[PDB]
Symmetry: none
Subunit: 69 residues, 9 copies
C-alpha cells in the first residue's frame, strides 16, 4: 500500500526584473577554406546560433516521479 | 493499492518585468570556399539561426510521472 | 506500507534584479584552412553559439523521486 | 504713513529640461491580516499613492505679506 | 513713516538640466499581522507614498514680510 | 522714520546638471507582528515614503522680514 | 606615351551602424552690447550654426589626378 | 613611356559601430561688451559652431596623382 | 621608361566599435570686455567651435604620387 502526500509551496516574490542585455557575436565572423576533402557527413554551424535569452517572471520548477513493481 | 495525493502550490508574484534586449549576430558574417570535396551529406547553417527570446510573465513548470506493474 | 509526507517551503523574496549584461564573442573571429583531409564525420561550430542568458524572477527547483520493488 | 516699493526681478534662463523618470513602487506590495480588532477610526492607504512629478519650465515663487494697525 | 525699497534680482542661467531618475520602493513590500488590538485611531500607510520628483527650470524663491502696530 | 534700501543680486550660472539617480528602498521590506496591544492613537508608515528628488535649475532663496512697533 | 592602369578596390563591409546622437549648443546663449562702434564690415554668427551630422553607410573616397605637357 | 599599374585593395570589415554621443557646448555661453571701438572688419562667432559628427560605415580613402613635363 | 607596380592591401578587421562620448565645453563660458580699441581686422570665436567626432568603420588611408620631368 502506497499513500505519499505532498503539500509543497514553491515560490518567488520578485519585486522588479529588467534591463537584461544579451549581445552574443557582436563582431565580424569570417571563414576561408582551400581544397579540403570531407569523406563522410558534415554538420557546419557558422555565425550566431542557438543563443537563448530566457527571462521568466517565475522560473520555479517542481519535478516528481513515482514507481512500483 | 496506490493513492498518491499532491496539493502543490507552484507560484510567482513578480512585480515588473521589462526592457529585455537580445542582439545575436550584430555584425558582418562571411564564408569563402575554394574547390572543396564532400562525399556524403552536409547540413550547413550560416548567419543568425535558432536564437530564442523567451520572456513569460510566468514560466513555472510542474512535471509529475507515475508507474505500476 | 509506504506513507511519506512532505511540507516543503521553497522560497525567494528577491527585491530588485536588473542591469544584467552578457557579451560573449564581442570581437572579430576568423578561421582559415588549407588542404585538410577528413576521413569520417565532422561537427564544426564557428562563431557565437549556444550562449544562455537565464534570469528567472524565481529560479527555485525541487526534485523528488519515490520507488518500491 | 506706509509707502513700500518693490521692483524685484525673479528669473530663470534655463536652456534645456528633459528625460525625467519617476518610478515609485515599481514592485510587488502585499498585506495579509488575521482576526484584528479596531475599536475606532481607520485611515488605510495601501499601494502607490500621492506621488508627484512636478516639472515646470519656470517654478519661481514670490511671496509677500503686509500688515498695519 | 515707512518707505522700504527693494530692487532684488534673484536669478539662474542654467545651461542644461536632465536625466533625473527617482526609483523609490523598487523592491517587494510585505506586511503580515496576527490578532492585534487597536483601541483608538489608526493611520496606516503601506507601499510607496508621498514621493516627490520636483525638477523646475527655475526654483528661485523670494519671501518678504512687513508689519506695524 | 524707516527707509531701508536693498540692491541684492542673488545668482547662479550653472553649466550642466544631470544624471542624478535617487534609489531609496530598492530592496525587499517585510514586517510580521503577533498579538500586540495598542491603547491609544497609531501612525504607521511602512515601505518607501516622503522621499524627495529636488533638482531645480536655480535653487536660490532670499528671505527678508521687517517690523516696527 | 601615357597608359596608366588602376584596378583599385575601395571597400567596406560594415555590419550595423546606429544610435548616433549629436547635441551641439544644448544650453542658453546670451549676448549684450552697449554703445559699440564698428567702422567697417561685420559678419556675426550667434547661436547654433553650421553643425554637421554625417552618417553615410559607405563614405569611401577615391581621388585621382593626371597631367601632361 | 609611362605605364604605372595599381591593383590596391583598401578595405574594412567592421562588425558593429554605434552609441556615438557628441555634446559640444552643453552649458551656458555669455558675452557682454561695453563701448568698444572697431576700426576695420570683424568676424564674430558666438555659441556652438561648425561642430562635426562624422560616422561613416567605411571612411577609407585613396588619393593618387600623376605628372609629366 | 617608367613601369611601377603596386599590389597593396590596406586593411582593418574591427570587431565592435561603440560607446564613444565626446563632451567639449560642457560648462559655463563667459567673456566681459570694457572700452577696448581694435585698429585692424578681428576674428573672434567664443563658445564651442570646430569640434570633431570622427568614428569611421574603416579609417584606412593610402596616398600615392608619381612624377617625371
Amino acid at each position: 500500500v502506497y499513500k505519499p502526500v505532498d503539500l509543497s509551496k514553491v515560490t518567488s516574490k520578485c519585486g522588479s526584473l529588467g534591463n537584461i542585455h544579451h549581445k552574443p557575436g557582436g563582431g565580424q565572423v569570417e571563414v576561408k577554406s582551400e581544397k579540403l576533402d570531407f569523406k563522410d557527413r558534415v554538420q557546419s554551424k557558422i555565425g550566431s546560433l542557438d543563443n537563448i535569452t530566457h527571462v521568466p517572471g517565475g522560473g520555479n520548477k517542481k519535478i516528481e516521479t513515482h514507481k512500483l513493481t
